[PDB]
Amino acid sequence: MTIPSEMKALLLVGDGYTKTPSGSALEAMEPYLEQGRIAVPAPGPSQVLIKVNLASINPSDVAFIKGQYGQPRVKGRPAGFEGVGTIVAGGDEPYAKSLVGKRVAFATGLSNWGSWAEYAVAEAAACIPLLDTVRDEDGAAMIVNPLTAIAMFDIVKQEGEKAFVMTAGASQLCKLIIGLAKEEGFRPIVTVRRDEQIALLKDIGAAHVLNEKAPDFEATLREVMKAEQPRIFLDAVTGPLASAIFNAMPKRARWIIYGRLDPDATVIREPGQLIFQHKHIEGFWLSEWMRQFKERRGPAILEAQKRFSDGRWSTVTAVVPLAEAIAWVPAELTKPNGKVFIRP
Among the listed residues 72, 1, 67, the one whose alpha carbon sits nearest the alpha carbon of residue 40: 1
**Which of 13, 267, 316, 319: binder of a second copy (CB under 8 A)?**
267
CB-CB contact of 317 with 335 (8 Å): yes
In whole angstroms, give the CA distance from residue 133 to residue 67.
Answer: 38
Site for K ion in 195-254 (CB under 5 A): none
Instruction: Kindly state whether residue 70 participates in binding a second copy, applying the rule CB under 8 A.
Output: yes
Residue among 187 and 252 whose Cβ is closer to a second copy: 252
DSSP bridge pairs for 117:
9
What is the largest distance, in Å, between two alpha-carbon atoms of the chain?
Answer: 66
Residue among 61 and 118 whose Cβ is closer to K ion: 61
x-marked contacts with a second copy along 214-243 as a string, rule CB under 8 A:
------------------------x-----
**Which of 93, 131, 161, 284: binder of a second copy (CB under 8 A)?**
284
CB 32 to K ion: min, Å: 12
**Which of 167, 247, 266, 305: binder of a second copy (CB under 8 A)?**
266
319, with CB counted inside 10 A (0-12, 13-18, 19+), is: middle
Instruction: Kindly state whether residue 148 participates in binding a second copy, applying the rule CB under 8 A.
Output: no
Instruction: Kindly state whether residue 31 participates in binding K ion, applying the rule CB under 5 A.
Output: no
Among the listed residues 285, 314, 326, the one whose alpha carbon sits nearest the alpha carbon of residue 109: 285
Instruction: Kindly state whether residue 263 participates in binding K ion, applying the rule CB under 5 A.
Output: no
Count CA within 13 A, CB hemisphere, residue 152: 34
16, with CB counted inside 10 A (0-12, 13-18, 19+), is: exposed
CB 38 to a second copy: min, Å: 28
Residue among 10 and 236 whose Cβ is closer to a second copy: 236
Residue among 75 and 312 whose Cβ is closer to K ion: 75
Secondary structure (DSSP) of 119-157: EEEEEGGGEEEPPTTS-HHHHTTSSHHHHHHHHHHHHHH
Instruction: Kindly state whether residue 272 participates in binding K ion, applying the rule CB under 5 A.
Output: no
Q: Which positions touch K ion (CB under 5 A)?
A: 15-16
Q: Which positions touch a second copy (CB under 8 A)?
A: 70, 238, 257-260, 265-268, 271-276, 278-285, 288
